[PDB]
Write a protein that binds this ligand. Structure first.
Ligand SMILES: Nc1ncnc2c1ncn2[C@H]1C[C@H](O)[C@@H](COP(=O)(O)OP(=O)(O)OP(=O)(O)O)O1
Length: 310
């Protein structure tokens, strides 16, 4: 009887000593703790990730439909890793970034590095050496797909001299660097030229806009769902949902009203949210309005919501 479970252990462990940690996991295991971790400014996602945020020194991929949220996450990530004496670098090859939105998200623009490569090759070289300086915490590439080769942009084919070669290369040599430097790297998507990225990424996130969050009126943002389809640091397949308000981004408040009930610290006495006797208000975003101004109560709720997990 114990020979099986014990033979599986000697073996299992054997697998880690040859191929790393998360080589063989078990969807249940809570096995743990890597101090280094950048909170995504989404308590929700953070636990779904298992280790409470994006691992540092690992390459990451956030993919999905347009306008779902991927970059809003990445930018929150920046802001966190940044508000802790972190130095971020945003290699922009889409010319889409909006500093006024980034600021409201807590990002330090003035101190944010911004490269606007010309060739895909350039971007990955600049990113590479820039990560080798071991000075950066996080680095994000906006749009994997928009990293076209020097050739495709000139004339010199029919697919052969590839992008999904340019990707395998840079990814190969840059993967190591990150390990040492302990810099964690976010890549945005929408394979294409990937097929190599999907393998490297120690964590892959499948983002998608589920609901169209309205505040009675009609528009305020939208509900985003995220499935962590690959995780070599914790158990995969967990998922999370959070609110994104056209203006502020991931709703901290909302993120609590959700967790607050999914964990009983708040009661649904019929569309009427309540916490320890006193009422928060009727209507999901009416309670967020309560949790907004009353930070004391939220601090305790967040505090209790955090103690109930880890
Ligand atoms: N500058 C902005 N001001 C206000 N809301 C914004 C802004 N940028 C994005 N949003 C809001 C509106 C959208 O419903 C939502 C989409 O987030 P966003 O981070 O742009 O997703 P994304 O970058 O993952 O997707 P994409 O693949 O199209 O690049 O966020």
């Amino acid at each position: 009887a114990p020979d099986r479970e014990k033979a599986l252990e000697l073996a299992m462990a054997q697998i880690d000593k040859n191929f790393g940690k998360g080589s063989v996991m078990r969807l249940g295991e809570e096995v743990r703790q890597p101090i280094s971790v950048i909170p995504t400014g989404s308590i929700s996602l953070d636990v779904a990730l298992g280790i409470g945020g994006l691992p540092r020194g690992r390459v990451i991929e956030i993919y999905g439909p347009e306008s779902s949220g991927k970059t809003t996450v990445a930018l929150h990530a920046v802001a966190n890793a940044q508000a802790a004496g972190g130095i971020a670098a945003f290699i922009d090859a889409e010319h889409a970034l909006d500093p006024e939105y980034a600021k409201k998200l807590g990002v330090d623009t003035d101190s944010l590095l911004v490269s606007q490569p010309d060739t895909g090759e350039q971007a990955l070289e600049i990113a590479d050496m820039l990560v080798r300086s071991g000075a950066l915490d996080i680095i994000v590439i906006d749009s994997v797909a928009a990293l076209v080769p020097r050739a495709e942009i000139e004339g010199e084919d029919s697919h052969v001299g590839l992008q999904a070669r340019l990707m395998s290369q840079a990814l190969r040599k840059m993967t190591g660097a990150l390990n040492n430097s302990g810099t964690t790297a976010i890549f945005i998507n929408q394979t294409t030229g990937g097929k190599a990225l999907k393998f490297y990424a120690s964590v892959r996130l499948d983002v998608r806009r589920i609901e169209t969050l309205k505040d009675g009126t009609d528009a305020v943002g939208n509900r985003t769902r995220v499935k962590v389809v690959k995780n070599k640091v914790s158990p995969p397949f967990k998922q999370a949902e959070f609110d994104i308000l056209y203006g502020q981004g991931i709703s901290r408040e909302g993120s609590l009203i959700d967790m607050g009930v999914e964990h009983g610290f708040i009661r649904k006495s019929g569309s009427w949210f309540t916490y320890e006797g006193e009422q928060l208000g009727q209507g999901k975003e009416n309670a967020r309005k309560f949790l907004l101004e009353n930070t004391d109560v939220a601090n305790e709720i967040e505090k209790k919501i955090k103690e109930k997990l880890g």
